UniProtKB/Swiss-Prot annotation, chain A:
After binding acetylcholine, the AChR responds by an extensive change in conformation that affects all subunits and leads to opening of an ion-conducting channel across the plasma membrane. Belongs to the ligand-gated ion channel (TC 1.A.9) family. Acetylcholine receptor (TC 1.A.9.1) subfamily. Delta/CHRND sub-subfamily. The gene is CHRND. This is Acetylcholine receptor subunit delta. The chain holds residues 319 to 359 of 516 of the full protein. It is found in: Postsynaptic cell membrane; Cell membrane. It comes from Bos taurus (Bovine).
From Swiss-Prot, chain B:
After binding acetylcholine, the AChR responds by an extensive change in conformation that affects all subunits and leads to opening of an ion-conducting channel across the plasma membrane. Coiled coil: none annotated. Belongs to the ligand-gated ion channel (TC 1.A.9) family. Acetylcholine receptor (TC 1.A.9.1) subfamily. Beta-1/CHRNB1 sub-subfamily. The chain crosses the membrane at residues 24-43. It is found in: Postsynaptic cell membrane; Cell membrane. This is Acetylcholine receptor subunit beta. It comes from Bos taurus. Pentamer of two alpha chains, and one each of the beta, delta, and gamma (in immature muscle) or epsilon (in mature muscle) chains. The muscle heteropentamer composed of alpha-1, beta-1, delta, epsilon subunits interacts with the alpha-conotoxin ImII. The chain holds residues 218 to 265 of 505 of the full protein.
Amino acid sequence: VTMVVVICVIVLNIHFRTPSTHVLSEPVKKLFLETLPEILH
Amino acid sequence: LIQPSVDPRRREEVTFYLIIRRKPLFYLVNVIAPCILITLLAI
């Protein structure tokens, strides 16, 4: 449960990232939106 | 064997001592580890 809370904190950090706060890296965007959505589903 | 102090004008005894160490495994599972986890969540 502790690890799941840590995971939730990280996921919420990922969700609320903003253009004026963080830079969306192209390798990250291509990994988490093309490769892994196909691998998982 | 404990002999008492000399009387200017307590009785002698035989004392058996037990030096005993507590084995804290229960408190390591029930108290310390949840506290560590709560401290990480507070981090």
